[PDB]
Amino acid sequence: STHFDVIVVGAGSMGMAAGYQLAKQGVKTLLVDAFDPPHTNGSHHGDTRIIRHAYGEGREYVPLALRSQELWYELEKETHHKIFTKTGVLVFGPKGESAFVAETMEAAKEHSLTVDLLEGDEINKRWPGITVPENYNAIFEPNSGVLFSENCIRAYRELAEARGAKVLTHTRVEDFDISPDSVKIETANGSYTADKLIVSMGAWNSKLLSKLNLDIPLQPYRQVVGFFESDESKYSNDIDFPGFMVEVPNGIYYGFPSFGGCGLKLGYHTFGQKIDPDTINREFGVYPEDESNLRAFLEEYMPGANGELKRGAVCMYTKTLDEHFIIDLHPEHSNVVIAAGFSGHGFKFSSGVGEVLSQLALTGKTEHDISIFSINRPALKESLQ
Numbered sequence: 001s002t003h004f005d006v007i008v009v010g011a012g013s014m015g016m017a018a019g020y021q022l023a024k025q026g027v028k029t030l031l032v033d034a035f036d037p038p039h040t041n042g043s044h045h046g047d048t049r050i051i052r053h054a055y056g057e058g059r060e061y062v063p064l065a066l067r068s069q070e071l072w073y074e075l076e077k078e079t080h081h082k083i084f085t086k087t088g089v090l091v092f093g094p095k096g097e098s099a100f101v102a103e104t105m106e107a108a109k110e111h112s113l114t115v116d117l118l119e120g121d122e123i124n125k126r127w128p129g130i131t132v133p134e135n136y137n138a139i140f141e142p143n144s145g146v147l148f149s150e151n152c153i154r155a156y157r158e159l160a161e162a163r164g165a166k167v168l169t170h171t172r173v174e175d176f177d178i179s180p181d182s183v184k185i186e187t188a189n190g191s192y193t194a195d196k197l198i199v200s201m202g203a204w205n206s207k208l209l210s211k212l213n214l215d216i217p218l219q220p221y222r223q224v225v226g227f228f229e230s231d232e233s234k235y236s237n238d239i240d241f242p243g244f245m246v247e248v249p250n251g252i253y254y255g256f257p258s259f260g261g262c263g264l265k266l267g268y269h270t271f272g273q274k275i276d277p278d279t280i281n282r283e284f285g286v287y288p289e290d291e292s293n294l295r296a297f298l299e300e301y302m303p304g305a306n307g308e309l310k311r312g313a314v315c316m317y318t319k320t321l322d323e324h325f326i327i328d329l330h331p332e333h334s335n336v337v338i339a340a341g342f343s344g345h346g347f348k349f350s351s352g353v354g355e356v357l358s359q360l361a362l363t364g365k366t367e368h369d370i371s372i373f374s375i376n377r378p379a380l381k382e383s384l385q
């Protein structure tokens with residue numbers, strides 16, 4: 001006997017942001033999560049997340065990145081939790097051999113972003129601790145940085161709850177019942193109804209969207225990161241070592257400077273094990289590649305940051321065929337909003353996405369251009385049962 005204006009299923013990166021946007025507008029919201037966010041079972045732990053504006057995945061993401069950036073600065077002011085540190089983000093790769101670096105450069109020009117262009121020894125000179133070949137070039141973004149992802153979700157949650165949003169934890173939604181004028185969810189702890197539904201279950205979207213008659217390719221991947229003891233006089237945020245996402249012959253890697261001596265953190269972006277979110281092995285180091293793919297990069301490009309492994313984490317990407325997100329209304333139900341397939345690079349946009357999801361749930365439209373994330377785009381290979 002407790003109807004809600006809006007029900008958000010999956011209160012993680014995207015869901016909690018949306019719940020915050022909804023609650024702030026006096027919209028009676030219920031957020032349901034299988035665990036207790038922030039947690040270490042989804043796609044948002046590992047402490048830090050890079051936010052970039054000049055976007056190598058595609059210049060069309062710049063508007064949402066700039067808006068998310070303004071929203072993170074707003075969040076920083078509203079909570080006691082630390083949200084963002086402006087480390088700047090370095091992107092580099094072999095000259096003329098990286099579509100990623102090239103699009104980052106074009107995105108910067110097209111949106112008049114502030115960036116520094118440098119190459120070869122200039123990179124190694126500017127940042128002691130980085131050793132790239134002379135044929136490498138780079139684009140550094142000084143005003144980009146690092147987000148503390150767990151803190152972000154915790155802040156959004158605390159603020160949304162203070163405004164009246166209810167968060168039902170450790171409750172797995174197992175099925176949905178959608179009608180032309182209402183939505184209903186089913187869980188072992190009871191069922192709930194609302195006028196609108198937002199679906200943002202991360203890796204589990206690949207197993208449960210079928211319950212909404214959707215058939216979209218979504219593949220979860222096991223993606224690890226490691227924190228390594230480093231030469232603090234070189235890799236510390238304190239001496240301005242940047243966050244980074246770079247392309248080398250064998251793939252793309254991303255990392256963060258050491259914060260307060262935690263050690264430089266690194267991840268291998270283009271490779272991960274295909275897995276199922278309910279059977280994934282979340283222990284770091286069980287596959288020899290977990291640690292060796294990271295050191296393979298470090299010994300070659302950041303040799304002073306290749307010491308003892310201090311900590312490891314195991315997390316998940318959920319990829320779509322084109323690696324672009326899905327943010328749109330359910331093709332058959334205008335009262336159901338879907339947010340999925342963030343393909344390993346969506347956290348930085350979570351603030352902006354929560355705003356988008358809130359707009360879609362309340363008005364069936366958004367002021368943002370989200371056409372590139374259409375659930376009906378051909379590259380997605382979407383369908384219904």
Ligand SMILES: *Cc1cc2c(cc1C)nc1c(=O)[nH]c(=O)nc-1n2C[C@H](O)[C@H](O)[C@H](O)COP(=O)(O)OP(=O)(O)OC[C@H]1O[C@@H](n2cnc3c(N)ncnc32)[C@H](O)[C@@H]1O
Binds near residue numbers: 174
């Ligand atoms: C894993 C990873 C991802 C990542 C990254 C490094 C790693 C190791 N670095 C990033 C970076 O530097 N910059 C960036 O912009 N993104 C980066 N990412 C990607 C980003 O973390 C992901 O795209 C993002 O976290 C996706 O968010 P989403 O909201 O989709 O996923 P979630 O945070 O896991 O939340 C989903 C929640 O839903 C719940 N759930 C699942 N099933 C159910 C059911 N049945 N009922 C109720 N709730 C459910 C989960 O519990 C979870 O909380």
Ligand SMILES: [Cl-]
Binds near residue numbers: 316318343345
């Ligand atoms: Cl993802």
